[PDB]
Design a protein around this ligand. Structure first.
Ligand SMILES: CCCc1sc(-c2ccc(OCCO)c(OCCO)c2)nc1CSc1nc(N)cc(N)n1
Ligand SMILES: CCCc1sc(-c2ccc(OCCO)c(OCCO)c2)nc1CSc1nc(N)cc(N)n1
Ligand SMILES: O=c1ccn([C@@H]2O[C@H](COP(=O)(O)OP(=O)(O)O)[C@@H](O)[C@H]2O)c(=O)[nH]1
Ligand SMILES: O=c1ccn([C@@H]2O[C@H](COP(=O)(O)OP(=O)(O)O)[C@@H](O)[C@H]2O)c(=O)[nH]1
Lengths: 229, 230
């Protein structure tokens, strides 16, 4: 009965801005933020190092990082289903990215750029599949909100944000991520190994224009979209 | 109602052999062979054969990745056995070849203590281990442990006897440290363990220094007296 909605989008496309604006509109709406975003406690401690290790040599840490990101995400998402929104009439939990983006956007891309060998990729996939076929329908998504944007907007938004460890992220990586987003979410040409994702509605929203003070139209779409599910 | 007994000991102490003796002795007794031994067809084998070989070559690079996939395959494979067979047995016993506690408190810990995992790999693995057993590995809880005790010397010979090409390069020095962590876990019961029920589980210790392959009957009697105390 709690609807599960994932917000997807390239680095710095404004997802955390969005979902924070959303948290403020409905007492009936909650947010699960991305743990890597949190890294960017023991987990908080482990995530810091592994994120810094990922930046300084990705071919060494990609497997470790991708398995830890996902597990940290799976336990924050499970926790909020048990923890937040308890007696709500129309419960919606918004996820800052998903187990699917973890694997079919980010981990797939890292494989393609040779930062994980085959053994690494099918170990990761094997692990991601056994486990993501253990929770019946409990994390499965009611729909997806694709925050569509350009890499230069995104590149611009990294400078403005001002995480110094990110101030090296080049355009072309951001450019790689986008095609993968656009390929999966927009032209819808990327079959997963998950059954229901074929019949999973998708709202795309243009976030190239700035929205911290002009979001009503975007939000109107989210409520419009939410009433079809 | 299945009873779950962990068979524990060093590399080439005789676990695989005793486990194949036991299984034939009753229709109520079955075994879950340890993934890592089959890795030395299925995609798990391919990954397994691959990462094990990488681990031989470069353990400082591969131990986390190895440890993670060996534990996962174990939990997986133990589940398949526990929710598969022994529906009909009146006195069902499942003998596991090693445990998730072996994986962690012998092998992972030794890799961490030998600097083949780093503080973050090992802390991430421990966090991963805490959680993976508790989301999925809960009915794998153990009733007993059987330690097959064999000197580091015994194994190297037996390693030579079993004759795998990869194993022959393993040094007495390695058998020594893994030899030393077994004792503290299961004899002294030195080992602090996150799983508090684990400090209370009955252990049985069996010296397996002589060829017991022809002549296993007294070992089998000690197992049998243990199983009815459980
Ligand atoms: C700070 C965001 C986390 C990072 S860091 C990182 C990365 C850092 C340095 C990199 O290169 C070093 C010089 O080539 C890098 O390049 C990978 C080669 O294609 C990726 N990619 C990422 C995106 S991978 C990722 N996986 C997830 N599962 C979630 C998520 N948010 N990000
Ligand atoms: C069948 C043995 C599998 C291997 S291979 C291996 C190993 C091989 C070569 C090694 O070094 C030679 C190159 O420097 C090596 O050194 C480890 C350094 O701490 C370990 N350790 C092991 C034991 S780790 C282990 N973890 C498990 N979880 C299960 C299991 N059966 N074994
Ligand atoms: O309409 C917007 C959306 C985002 N940003 C900025 O873009 C940066 C990245 O946004 P966010 O942290 O939400 O990115 P994401 O969560 O998608 O990585 C932040 O500094 C935002 O303040 C902005 O100035 N106007
Ligand atoms: O009493 C024994 C115990 C073991 N072995 C041999 O020693 C090797 C190692 O035994 P096993 O594979 O059972 O050891 P594990 O690695 O399973 O502990 C094998 O070739 C066995 O046939 C033996 O000849 N007599």
């Amino acid at each position: 009965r709690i609807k599960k909605i994932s917000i997807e989008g390239n680095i710095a496309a404004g997802k955390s801005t969005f979902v924070n604006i959303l948290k403020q509109l409905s007492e009936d709406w909650e947010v699960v933020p991305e743990p890597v975003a949190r890294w960017s406690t023991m987990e908080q401690k482990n995530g810091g190092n592994v994120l810094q290790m990922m930046y300084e040599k990705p071919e060494r840490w990609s497997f470790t990082f991708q398995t830890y990101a996902c597990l940290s995400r799976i336990r924050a998402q499970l926790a909020s289903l048990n923890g937040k929104l308890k007696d709500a009439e129309k419960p919606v939990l918004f996820f800052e990215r998903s187990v699917y983006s973890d694997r079919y956007i980010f981990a797939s891309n890292l494989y393609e750029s040779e930062s994980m060998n085959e053994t690494e990729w099918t170990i990761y996939q094997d692990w991601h599949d056994w486990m993501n076929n253990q929770f019946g329908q409990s994390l499965e998504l009611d729909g997806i909100i694709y925050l569509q944007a350009t890499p230069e907007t995104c590149l611009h938004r990294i400078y403005l944000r001002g995480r110094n460890e990110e101030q090296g992220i080049p355009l072309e990586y951001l450019e790689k991520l986008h095609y993968k987003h656009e390929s999966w979410l927009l032209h819808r040409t990327l079959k997963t190994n998950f059954d229901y994702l074929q019949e999973v509605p998708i709202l795309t929203l243009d976030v190239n224009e700035d929205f911290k003070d002009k979001y009503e139209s975007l939000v109107e779409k989210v409520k419009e979209f939410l009433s079809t599910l």
